[PDB]
Amino acid sequence: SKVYDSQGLLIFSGMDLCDCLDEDCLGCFYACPACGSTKCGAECRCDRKWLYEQIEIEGGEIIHNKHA
């Protein structure tokens, strides 16, 4: 089932979260080609059926999704 609504807000909480997984990020991407948002990663958040559980920095820290 969907994790985000048609605008790329989380269904569970309604929050508008950057795919870089810093909960406080303003949106660090260029405009998403599909919806315009600076918060969408490789795949648009709108109606997406998954979220990122973690991000591994090559040579560095693992970042965990603070919400999941």
What is the end-to-end Cα distance of the chain in Å, rounded?
16
Q: Which of 15, 45, 59, 66 binds another protein (CB under 8 A)?
A: 59
Note whether 19 binds another protein by CB under 8 A.
yes
15 contributes a contact to another protein by CB under 8 A: no
Based on the shown chain and the rule CB under 5 A, indicate whether residue 11 belongs to the binding site for Zn ion.
no
Supply 37's token pair: 């948002």
Quote the CA–CA distance of 18 and 63 in Å, as a whole number.
13
Q: Note whether 55 and 63 are within 8 A (CB).
A: yes
Sites of contact with another protein (CB under 8 A): 19-20, 22, 25-30, 41-43, 49-60, 65, 68
